[PDB]
Amino acid sequence: GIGDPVTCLKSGAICHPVFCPRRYKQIGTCGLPGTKCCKK
Amino acid sequence: GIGDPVTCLKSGAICHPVFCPRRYKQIGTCGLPGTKCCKKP
After folding, report:
1. What angle do CA A36, A37, B1 make, to 5 degrees?
2. Closest Cα of chain B to A35: distance in Å?
């Protein structure tokens, strides 16, 4: 359900290009192509 | 994404049947309709 940067950041996650960095779980995208919404 | 209760709970979040309570934010669902995967920022 998470597909835009504002929603991602509001959820306490971080937007990153191409992949979530180690430890983080992917919970969605940030809308722009390739971006991942990543929760530590 | 998170769309089932096992994925949700493994990450240390809660599964709530209606809403994320005070201090928690929604990070997905727990599969069943209306359920919310919730975690404190």
Report:
1. 95
2. 13
